Amino acid sequence: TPSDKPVAHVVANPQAEGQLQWLNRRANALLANGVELRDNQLVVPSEGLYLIYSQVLFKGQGCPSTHVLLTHTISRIAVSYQTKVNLLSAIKSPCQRETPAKPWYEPIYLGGVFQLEKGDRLSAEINRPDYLDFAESGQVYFGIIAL
Amino acid sequence: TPSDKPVAHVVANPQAEGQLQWLNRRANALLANGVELRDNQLVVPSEGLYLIYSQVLFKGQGCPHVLLTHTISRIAVSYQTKVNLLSAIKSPCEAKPWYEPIYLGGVFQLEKGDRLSAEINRPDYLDFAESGQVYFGIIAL
Amino acid sequence: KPVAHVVANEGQLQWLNGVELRDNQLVVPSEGLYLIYSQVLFKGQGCPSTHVLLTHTISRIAVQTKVNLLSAIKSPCKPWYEPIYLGGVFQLEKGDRLSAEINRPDYLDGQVYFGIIAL
Ligand SMILES: Cc1ccc(C)c(Cn2c([C@H](O)c3ccncc3)nc3ccc(-c4cnn(C)c4)cc32)c1
């Protein structure tokens, strides 16, 4: 007998270079028990505690003239307050100095447990999609699990 | 009454050289309700939504650049292909010692007979200081 | 199904909440398979002179020895943030106790919790 818990695990679209496009229609991605993917956002079908999680992976070749700040932010748009409240975020600086040019890899991971309401819209956003790495699958993903 | 959910929590072997070797014959390690451990892979006994998870802990004594990787993969019987579900790549860098835990998890639709691997590139960098540091599991929902 | 999910409060890591919370420890009420999970978040401002290691550990106090179930270590060395995630499935006994602890409650900061679910 299947579980009735709302869950989702969506993944970056690897041919959408220069963007972060979440897919549920791809090998090993899923929407279940009422969770929708609408306008690049996950939509919560019932109230409760959810674990939210996400990973993005950034990659560059050597360090450029201008200072690089990589961010990843998960936000919540409630029906009763329809503007992005940040739930989780992290900043990373992959580069100490300008390359005086080996690859660097900087992942950012965000997870937490939050109360959510029906109709909640969750977004998972980066500032620099030009540094995303879509080399193989499994690197960039976003999901929720009702507790 | 005991739960009939397929479950597994397997643990890395501290004395397998140049290898990430999963064990279930240890304390607080576990195969139950159909899950098998064959060729270092966990084998699913039935269709369903599963939680899947793995931790690995890397440790180096200083910095000369090193890349660390950690990947959970699926092989579906029906497709006979090997495909990543979760994957992390990470540059960790008198010599003071660094630690890098990588914890991979998510929920997935799995089919009867699927085989799952949890793999890294630098077994020489695994740390076994304490128990509980390197592990691999699945939980039917 | 027995479930708990507790969270932090200073000075220490104290958990404010048919699973009981006796002595900052969750107490198993029946024998079976449990999913157990936790996270903690550490904050500092700048790097100290003495080398700091942050650990986080979930232990099973059986029924009376004490053994790691899940554990990890981070080395942080401009403000910084380092989380630590733990989670897995375990066969437990009626009356076993579970601790989720850290070594440096001084660097402790949604993201700080501990819980178990009977499967
Ligand atoms: C993404 C993921 C997949 C599998 C597992 C075992 C975990 C472990 N876990 C953790 C763990 O701190 C973590 C790990 C990775 N991302 C976010 C959090 N917190 C949890 C908080 C809650 C739960 C939880 C409670 N019920 N269910 C069905 C899952 C698990 C939780 C995380």
Side-chain angles (χ1 to χ4, degrees), chain A residues 1-64 66-91 93-95 100-101 103-117 119-135 137-147, chain B residues 1-37 39-64 66-93 95 97-141, chain C residues 2-9 11-13 15 18-19 21 23-42 44 46-48 51-63 65-77 79-93 95-96 98-119:
Chain A
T1 314
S3 169
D4 75 347
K5 304 291 178 162
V7 293
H9 182 97
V10 303
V11 315
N13 183 349
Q15 32 177 0
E17 288 158 348
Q19 316 191 55
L20 193 33
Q21 208 202 11
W22 297 120
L23 305 171
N24 70 282
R25 302 182 205 183
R26 179 152 258 255
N28 307 305
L30 91 98
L31 297 178
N33 303 318
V35 181
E36 303 167 313
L37 176 59
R38 206 198 299 149
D39 288 325
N40 217 49
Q41 297 168 341
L42 293 172
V43 186
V44 182
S46 62
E47 78 95 34
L49 287 172
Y50 292 68
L51 164 68
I52 309 163
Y53 63 96
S54 181
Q55 184 177 260
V56 298
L57 176 60
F58 291 108
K59 183 192 156 172
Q61 190 74 39
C63 294
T66 324
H67 183 55
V68 189
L69 277 161
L70 303 168
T71 52
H72 189 30
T73 307
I74 292 177
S75 309
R76 165 183 193 249
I77 303 191
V79 170
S80 73
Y81 179 54
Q82 294 192 14
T83 197
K84 293 176 176 170
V85 177
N86 286 355
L87 287 177
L88 282 163
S89 49
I91 318 204
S93 280
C95 284
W104 54 259
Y105 288 79
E106 191 63 53
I108 317 187
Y109 194 87
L110 300 178
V113 183
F114 296 88
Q115 172 73 36
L116 307 178
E117 295 309 305
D120 275 354
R121 273 174 282 155
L122 321 172
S123 32
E125 291 175 79
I126 62 178
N127 66 351
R128 298 300 301 266
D130 49 346
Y131 283 112
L132 277 184
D133 184 1
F134 305 143
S137 11
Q139 300 186 335
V140 193
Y141 53 89
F142 176 30
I144 74 187
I145 310 193
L147 267 69
Chain B
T1 308
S3 197
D4 63 324
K5 290 167 166 152
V7 297
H9 180 93
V10 299
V11 299
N13 187 351
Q15 296 304 145
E17 313 296 321
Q19 209 174 349
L20 179 46
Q21 192 188 11
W22 300 118
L23 302 176
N24 71 296
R25 289 145 63 98
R26 297 294 195 273
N28 315 294
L30 155 54
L31 304 179
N33 304 313
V35 178
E36 299 171 353
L37 180 52
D39 310 307
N40 216 47
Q41 303 168 325
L42 293 179
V43 188
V44 192
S46 60
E47 177 255 326
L49 287 176
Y50 285 76
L51 273 204
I52 299 171
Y53 68 93
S54 175
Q55 167 174 322
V56 296
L57 182 65
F58 291 114
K59 175 242 204 178
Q61 226 85 26
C63 286
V66 200
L67 280 194
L68 303 166
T69 70
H70 174 221
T71 298
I72 303 186
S73 311
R74 193 190 168 211
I75 308 178
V77 291
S78 282
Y79 300 79
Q80 305 297 327
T81 59
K82 184 184 187 164
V83 146
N84 303 349
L85 304 176
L86 302 156
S87 203
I89 300 168
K90 172 49 155 193
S91 318
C93 292
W98 54 262
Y99 287 92
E100 289 273 323
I102 301 177
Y103 189 106
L104 298 171
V107 53
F108 302 83
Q109 174 64 28
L110 303 166
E111 296 303 324
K112 178 182 166 205
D114 288 352
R115 278 153 46 214
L116 308 165
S117 291
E119 296 188 56
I120 58 155
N121 67 329
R122 300 301 297 269
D124 39 318
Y125 277 132
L126 284 166
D127 186 81
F128 294 106
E130 295 184 89
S131 272
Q133 294 182 350
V134 175
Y135 54 85
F136 179 22
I138 78 174
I139 301 165
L141 278 174
Chain C
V3 292
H5 177 88
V6 306
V7 293
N9 173 245
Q12 68 178 121
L13 184 55
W15 300 120
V19 182
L21 184 64
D23 312 290
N24 214 35
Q25 308 194 149
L26 304 171
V27 184
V28 185
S30 59
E31 169 177 319
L33 301 163
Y34 294 73
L35 160 59
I36 307 164
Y37 56 82
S38 84
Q39 183 181 165
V40 307
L41 172 58
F42 294 95
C47 280
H51 190 55
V52 157
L53 297 161
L54 313 157
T55 77
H56 179 36
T57 301
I58 291 186
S59 316
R60 174 189 194 190
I61 292 148
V63 78
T65 45
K66 180 165 157 152
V67 190
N68 298 15
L69 294 188
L70 304 150
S71 200
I73 303 188
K74 268 194 183 177
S75 57
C77 314
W80 55 265
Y81 292 87
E82 288 302 328
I84 300 196
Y85 317 95
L86 309 169
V89 62
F90 295 88
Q91 169 68 56
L92 302 176
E93 291 274 32
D96 286 340
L98 314 159
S99 58
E101 286 163 47
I102 47 154
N103 64 332
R104 298 302 291 271
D106 49 312
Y107 280 97
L108 196 65
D109 176 321
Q111 283 191 246
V112 183
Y113 54 77
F114 175 24
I116 75 170
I117 307 187
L119 312 187

